[PDB]
Design a protein around this nucleic acid. Structure first.
Lengths: 709, 232, 171, 232, 118, 55, 10
RNA sequence: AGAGGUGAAAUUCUUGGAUUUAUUGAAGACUAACUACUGCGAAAGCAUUUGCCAAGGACGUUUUCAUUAAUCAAGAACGUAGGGAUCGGGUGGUGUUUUUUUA
């Protein structure tokens, strides 16, 4: 976790360490409770000692309310207040052993206690390598969510007074060791007050720091890029509550007539920008407008002002990765779309409104056999499509979303499979006939579909909605499932697995696809960065040329895997942290001894021990029948598909090995060269490789104004 | 009478009007208005109302008198600038419809399944199906054999616990608005008995997952607070 | 703005009798573009392309209540009156002799009500319609509900003397 | 039904009218002969008082109508009307052209206590409300703008400014005199220990003295002309 | 474009409650009974007393601004007479005729479903 | 495709009704053996395959 | 009525 | 500012807000409408769903045994013919509801 016992007062993640761990274990030996109830006995070994330790650290605060007391010369209890710093009192010394690290470092360590406690107390699966044997401290943006680098060219210790706007006082040099110390404590307090309910946790870490200075020299005598203090530039690492990133108004206290001290310090901290406003509720409250841009998250703008207003007036901020991929996101032709966020879903809601008026006008009419239910299954209906869907945007091949519709269980149906799918075409003929009869402002046509093999006579009904959208309609019946099963049963015995593959494609296209889009569309409103991480993953995967084999639901499942199981990390509060968590995981991931079980559940209906063991057992016999992954490479199993072979089927071994190799090359580049603009451009290079074949294709028109990006 | 009666409280100048907005499963999402209190300190009347039920009629939701009965219940659980964006909380027939349906020389089948949906909403959803006099039937009764009762109740409990456990609350409300699972019950149990009008008559909630204001906003539509021209 | 007014089939034929003497005292004077929907038994009064709609509406509303044309022109003139309906509800014993105590004989007690409190009342077999001044309607309804609650006709005649003096003498 | 009483010995009803909706607002002009009635519907009728007749209809308004104001001194020329609603809007009206001038949609609660004045035309108006905006607008003949709102802590019920220039704020058993182009209440009365509050300010002898009515049915004299020069 | 309360008329015997509450049913507006419009302890459930009780309820309801009513009539129900009394239809009819729109008439008498008598 | 699936349904229902009528008209064997048949079954191939699946 | 002949039998 | 309760009264409670209204929670009792000249049980009695435990009736039967039956002391456990319907089972008919290779 990166917690060595050096110091976090000097601006580095650490301070807590191994003998502090010893001291709290032996302090919890003789009690721990408020009545000194024995937290730790040596009746249980290191595993339950460790579990009780993490339980006590996660359920017993030290910073702000309560901390441990003990005296070595002798019970140990839990006193009630907190000293606004990590604290535990040892009265036989009168010392505060946890005052080597700071408030945010203790805060993030209590979070790590809670998180590893959550993934340790469960009796479901085993994750010992997930909890120990992966050094999460290797990368910055992997254990953190986003990063800023403050470059402060202060010049000299005397040039301070016109190069930086911070304090310079006896009262700060008496409590802070040096320049990096007072700027560190000032910058963590102004980041805390600037964001507050805008981020999960802040960690400050001055890089270029070193505890190294030679024999001949009196000090660190080092030109640290515009100063001579032991740090080069300031890592400002943020992990964010992702539900309030792009909320464009933060709120101070309201307006009394007597302008009290909280509104006072709010107006001092925010200067000319923030003011008191009316709202639709009618409250008169202190706030400030944050002009949201697409490429820029407003978290960078608020930290830019909280840097360039208080600690310096000419220092500058380095964060270019977010804007570097945010134009790799495709920007749709929408009104003020540059000022729209990436966490805005107004395009998907616009087609959902168009779909709902279509839904009403297809329910309010008369068939010879009424509608049981229609259910959209589209990638836009699960927030995944690469165009953020603008009306009239034909050039995207998934412009036409697909909606399954099923009538009621009439036992009048034709028998053989071509006849029943032709009867479904007959129903679609009737529905578009009445559609053009009554509401001719919608238009329509028919298109053959061959995404299922060997059924030659299956068409879909495509409609063009005058709000400007296009929907496929595929009729499902209660009969096609048992028709495919009895076709399986009476087929010739050397022709079984191909018809089984046909039925698997049918199940993936019609049946399990509905609960698929239902579950992850329901969970995307709890994991808010899901649609941007899948959209950037899919554009990465098409630049590296895999979508012609892999399916989009499989790419969607590989991208939900770091969200519904993010342990040991956080859920990703930013797009970069999501994307490199994806690629780090799939570079880690094997196939031969590695399935992929995920439960698409809400945080804090799940997958229990029995279903887990059944999934692992059919995986086990599946790939002892399959020796090394000759034709079955991945295994993605959810609650909605305990088979796991539904989306992984069909992809060739060169494509799957190319994906895993590209992931390992990407994590190699990440740990070697670091993040940069040319790093991200090399991460989106085609990797064309000149493997035997290159064609260059250009249709006689350009199609981005027509696709709407 | 004998006490002292605190003559004047004038309790409408301090009272405030909100209005409620249904989810987009319906179409006439505006429903009505509601008194609360002055939104002030020590009470927080903006959040003192955020669990209230409302009981509308589905004819007044859908603009079609064909389902004049079936008064449903919405639940305010948030505030967004005087607009209470509500969500589903239940469903119930009027007493008029069930008393007009129940009549003798026929028998009725009850069913009710408690069931968690694909979300964490557990419901218990009810069902009434009456026994139909067959066309050409000359005898008086048309009762059920009382062992066809059990097979009917078994398959009606089975197919409505297949409609739930699957089909999340948006899909559930959108599938019990246009009376389609009644027709499902009819088309799957016209084998055993003819079964004139089948209905669901009641959906009760029992537990809810959490607030989830993202999905609660996605049920209605997008809109956020912004600035106002202060000029001071 | 427009207004529909439903009409029942027990004032329909006298409306056809007096149909020639309502719209010539209306359309040239209180314009109100008029149709008469016999298809659904309503009367349509829509606005003028060249607040009289309320006056025409309660004009024919007093007519379908069943008051005289003199009273309906007395509603066009004197724009301060009020129409009012209430039905008894307070089967034979509590219907027949009760409306008998209302009417007295030949409408003489109803005539005493009317000439005492300056209103104009009419009544069907069960309902009561009273129009005129507001305090007069209050007082006349009070006397009528007294004598259907049960009071001697001489005692409500004394109450009629007091209320007639009060509402035909000033202050 | 409205009644006018010739205030002499013959206090007979000179004219009664029957209005559309029950009414809680009448405004008179600075002289006599001009009276404006506002119902619980948005219908603002203006009536002559010499011989009683409706003289201005003014039907096209939004909600139930809260307080409204005339304009015009003795032998003026404009003869305007304020007409502020409950839902927030104020539609200013003139009778000399039988017409509207502007429409204002800046409040949220019931617009109460509004008044117009000019200084050389300017014709700026104040318009308070049950919220805590005070809401002056520039209000030219053809164009439109808005000045500061000064944002009290109060529940403004029927407060009219435009003194010699200080502005009144009443309705929480508190009389504030907010200042021009600033927010500084300098005249703030002693709020009583009970909560019963001011319903009505009343100018006496052309804004010289002042009556405050109270919700326990009392009335107080203020002497704002002396207290403007005087110091609570 | 009207605005709706609900009526919640309780047509018990020996009394008659009418209080139009808000649409949720929580903030009640202008409760009157049938016992505070006449004072004799006998006629306090009369149709006339109930209808004039309804008249001044409609007065204060139009004062607040509610212009239309979903009406819910309630008998004494439960283990008792289960029929609406004399004043229910009277108060409903008076609220109808006194300038107040009425929609969705409904009977919310509490059916026992095998309560206790044994 | 209107007339195409019109002709397809018009031959399918013809051969279907022919098959079902041939099923439950009368089946005596070469000797006397009346074949047991369902109330609403449709094909000799259907009863053949279900008597195969009940092996 | 070609589409009605196609949608017989139901 | 009244509300249970009354034949009125009386009495009861109510400004420490009752009655009524809305949202929940607990408790045990009970299975309304469906309910009939219908069902079951030796009788008294017996109506929510599901599961389990056994029992019983009638019907079906080209199954078996061969008078094993009948009636109460004593004692034992429980508190005249005919006709129209209708319930339970069976057989046959051949039209509609039904359906079709999952049972």
């Amino acid at each position: 976790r990166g917690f060595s016992s050096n110091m976090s007062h000097s601006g580095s993640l650490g301070g807590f360490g191994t003998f502090e761990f010893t001291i709290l274990m032996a302090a919890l030996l003789n009690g721990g409770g408020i009545n000194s109830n024995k937290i730790l006995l040596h009746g249980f070994s290191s595993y339950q000692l460790f579990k009780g330790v993490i339980k006590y650290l996660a359920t017993m605060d030290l910073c702000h309310d309560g901390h441990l007391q003990f005296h070595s010369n002798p019970a140990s209890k839990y006193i009630d207040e907190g000293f606004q710093t990590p604290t535990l009192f040892d009265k036989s010394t009168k010392v505060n052993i946890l005052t080597k690290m700071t408030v945010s470092s203790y805060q993030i360590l209590k979070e790590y206690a809670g998180e590893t406690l959550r993934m340790l107390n469960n009796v479901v699966q085993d994750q010992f390598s997930n909890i120990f044997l992966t050094n999460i401290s290797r990368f910055d943006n992997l254990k953190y969510d986003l990063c800023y680098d403050v470059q402060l060219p202060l010049g000299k210790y005397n040039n301070l007074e016109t190069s930086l706007a911070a304090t310079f006082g006896s009262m700060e040099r008496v409590k802070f060791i040096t320049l990096e110390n007072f700027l560190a404590h000032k910058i963590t307090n102004v980041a805390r007050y600037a964001l507050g309910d805008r981020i999960k946790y802040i960690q400050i870490e001055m890089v270029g720091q070193k505890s190294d200075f030679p024999i001949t020299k009196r000090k660190v005598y080092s030109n640290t890029g515009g100063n001579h203090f032991n740090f080069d530039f300031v890592r400002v690492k943020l992990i964010v509550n992702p539900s309030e990133c792009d909320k464009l108004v933060t709120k101070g206290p309201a307006h009394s007539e007597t302008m009290s001290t909280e509104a006072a310090v709010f107006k001092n901290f925010w200067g000319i920008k923030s003011s008191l406003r009316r709202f639709k509720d009618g409250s008169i409250t202190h706030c400030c407008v944050w002009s949201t841009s697409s490429s820029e998250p407003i978290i960078s703008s608020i930290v830019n002002f909280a840097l360039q207003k208080h600690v310096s007036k000419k220092a500058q901020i380095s964060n270019e990765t977010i804007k570097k991929f945010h134009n790799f996101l495709p920007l749709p032709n929408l009104p003020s779309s540059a000022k729209t966020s990436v966490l805005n879903l107004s395009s998907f809601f616009n087609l959902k409104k168009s779909f709902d008026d279509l839904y009403k006008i297809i329910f309010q009419m008369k068939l010879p056999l009424s509608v049981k239910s229609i259910l959209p299954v589209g990638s836009a209906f699960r927030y995944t499509s690469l165009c953020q869907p603008v009306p009239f945007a034909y050039s995207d091949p998934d412009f036409f979303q697909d909606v399954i519709l099923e009538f009621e269980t009439s036992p009048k149906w034709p028998d053989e499979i071509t006849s029943l799918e032709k009867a479904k075409t007959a129903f679609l003929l009737k529905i578009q006939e009445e559609l053009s009869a009554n509401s001719s402002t919608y238009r329509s046509f028919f298109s053959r579909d061959e995404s299922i093999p060997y059924n030659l006579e299956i068409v879909t009904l495509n409609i063009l909605t005058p709000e400007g959208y296009g929907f496929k309609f595929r009729v499902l019946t209660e009969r096609d499932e048992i028709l495919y099963l009895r076709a399986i049963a009476n087929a010739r015995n050397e022709l079984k697995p191909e018809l089984e593959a046909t039925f698997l494609k049918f199940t993936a296209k019609y049946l399990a696809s509905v609960r698929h889009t239902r579950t992850l569309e329901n969970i995307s409103h709890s994991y808010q960065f899901y649609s941007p991480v899948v959209r950037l993953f899919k554009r990465w995967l098409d630049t590296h040329l895999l979508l012609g084999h892999i399916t989009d639901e499989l790419a969607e499942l590989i991208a939900i895997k770091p969200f519904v199981d993010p342990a040991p990390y956080f859920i990703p509060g930013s797009l970069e942290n999501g994307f490199l968590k994806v690629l780090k995981f799939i570079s880690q991931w094997n196939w031969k001894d590695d399935p992929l079980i995920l439960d698409l559940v809400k945080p804090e209906e799940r997958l229990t021990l029995a279903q887990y063991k059944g999934i692992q057992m059919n995986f086990t016999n599946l790939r002892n029948s399959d020796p090394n992954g000759t034709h079955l490479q991945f295994f993605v199993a959810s609650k909605n598909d305990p088979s796991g072979i539904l989306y992984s089927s069909g992809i060739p071994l060169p494509i799957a090995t190319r994906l895993t190799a590209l992931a390992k090359v990407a994590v190699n580049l990440l740990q070697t060269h670091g993040l940069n603009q040319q790093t991200i451009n090399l991460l989106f290079t085609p990797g064309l490789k000149d493997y035997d074949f290159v064609v260059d294709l250009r249709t006689p028109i350009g199609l981005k104004s027509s696709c709407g990006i | 009478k004998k006490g002292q009666k605190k003559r004047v409280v004038d309790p409408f100048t301090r009272k405030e009007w909100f209005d409620i907005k249904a989810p987009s499963t319906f179409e006439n999402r505006n429903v009505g208005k509601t008194l609360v209190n002055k939104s002030t300190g020590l009470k927080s009347a903006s959040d003192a109302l955020k669990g209230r039920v409302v009981e509308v009629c589905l004819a007044d939701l859908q603009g079609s008198e064909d389902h004049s009965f079936r008064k449903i219940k919405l639940r305010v659980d948030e505030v967004q600038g005087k607009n209470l964006l509500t969500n589903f909380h239940g469903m119930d027939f009027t007493t008029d419809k069930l008393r007009s349906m129940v009549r003798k020389w026929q028998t009725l089948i009850e069913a009710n399944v408690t069931v968690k949906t694909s979300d964490d909403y557990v419901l218990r959803i009810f069902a009434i199906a009456f026994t139909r006099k067959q066309a050409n039937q000359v005898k008086r009764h048309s009762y059920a054999q009382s062992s066809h009762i059990r097979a009917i109740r078994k398959v009606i409990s089975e197919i409505l616990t297949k409609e739930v456990q699957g089909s999340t609350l948006a899909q559930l409300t959108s599938k019990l608005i246009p009376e389609v699972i009644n027709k499902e019950i009819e088309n799957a149990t016209k084998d055993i008995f003819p079964l004139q009008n089948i209905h669901v008559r009641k959906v009760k909630l029992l537990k809810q997952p959490k607030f989830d204001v993202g999905a609660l906003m996605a049920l209605h539509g997008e809109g956020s607070g912004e600035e106002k021209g202060k000029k001071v | 703005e427009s207004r529909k007014i439903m009409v029942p089939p027990h004032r329909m034929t006298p409306l056809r009798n007096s149909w020639t003497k309502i719209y010539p005292p209306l359309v040239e004077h209180l314009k109100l573009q008029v149709r008469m929907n016999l298809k659904t038994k309503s009367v349509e009064l829509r606005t003028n392309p060249k607040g009289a709609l309320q006056k025409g509406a309660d004009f024919i509303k007093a007519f379908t209540l069943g008051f005289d044309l003199d009273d309906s022109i007395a509603l066009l003139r004197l724009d301060d009156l009020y129409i009012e309906t209430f039905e008894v509800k307070d089967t034979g014993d509590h219907l027949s002799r009760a409306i008998g105590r209302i009417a007295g004989k030949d409408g003489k007690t109803k005539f005493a009500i009317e000439n005492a409190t300056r209103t104009r009342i009419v009544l069907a077999d069960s309902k009561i319609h009273i129009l005129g001044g507001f305090t007069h309607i209050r007082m006349a309804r009070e006397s009528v509900v007294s004598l259907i609650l049960g009071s001697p006709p001489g005692k409500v005649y004394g109450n009629l003397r007091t209320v007639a003096s009060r509402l035909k003498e000033r202050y | 039904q409205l009644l006018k009483i010739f205030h002499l010995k013959t206090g007979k009803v000179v004219r009664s009218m029957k209005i559309s909706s029950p009414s809680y607002i009448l405004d008179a002009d600075s002289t006599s002969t001009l009276l404006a009635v506002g119902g619980t519907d948005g219908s603002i009728i203006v009536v002559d008082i010499e011989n009683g007749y409706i003289t201005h209809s003014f039907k096209g308004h939004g909600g139930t109508i809260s307080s409204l104001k005339f304009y015009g001194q003795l032998n003026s020329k404009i003869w305007l009307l304020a007409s502020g609603d409950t839902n927030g809007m104020v539609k200013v009206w003139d009778l000399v052209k039988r017409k509207c001038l502007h429409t204002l949609q800046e409040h949220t609660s019931a617009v109460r206590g509004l008044d117009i004045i000019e200084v050389p035309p300017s014709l700026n108006l104040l318009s308070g409300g049950r919220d805590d905006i005070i809401n002056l607008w520039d209000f030219n003949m053809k164009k439109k703008c808005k000045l500061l709102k000064t944002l009290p802590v109060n529940q403004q019920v029927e407060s009219c400014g435009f003194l010699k220039i200080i502005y009144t704020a009443g309705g929480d058993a508190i009389f504030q005199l907010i200042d021009s182009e600033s927010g500084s209440v300098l005249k703030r009365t002693n709020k009583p220990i009970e909560e019963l509050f001011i319903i009505g300010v009343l100018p006496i002898l052309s804004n010289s003295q002042m009556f405050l009515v109270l919700s326990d049915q009392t009335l107080q004299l203020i002497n704002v002309e002396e207290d403007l020069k005087n110091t609570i | 474009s009207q605005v709706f309360g609900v009526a919640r008329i309780y047509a018990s015997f020996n009394d008659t409650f009418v209080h139009v509450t808000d649409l949720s049913g929580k903030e009640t507006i202008a409760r009157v009974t049938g016992g505070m419009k006449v004072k004799a302890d006998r006629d306090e459930s009369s149709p006339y007393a109930a209808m004039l009780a309804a008249q001044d309820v409609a007065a204060k309801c139009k004062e607040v601004g509610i212009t239309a009513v979903h009406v819910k009539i309630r008998a004494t129900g439960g283990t008792r007479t289960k029929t609406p009394g004399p004043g229910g239809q009277a108060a409903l009819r008076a609220l109808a005729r006194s300038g107040l729109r009425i929609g969705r008439i409904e009977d919310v008498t509490p059916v026992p479903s095998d309560s206790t008598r044994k | 495709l209107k007339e195409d699936i019109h002709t397809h349904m018009a031959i399918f229902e013809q051969r279907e009704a022919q098959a079902q009528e041939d099923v439950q008209s009368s089946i005596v064997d070469e000797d006397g053996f009346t074949l047991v048949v369902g109330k609403n079954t449709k094909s000799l191939n259907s009863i053949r395959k279900k008597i195969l699946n009940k092996n | 009525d070609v589409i009605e002949e196609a949608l017989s039998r139901f």
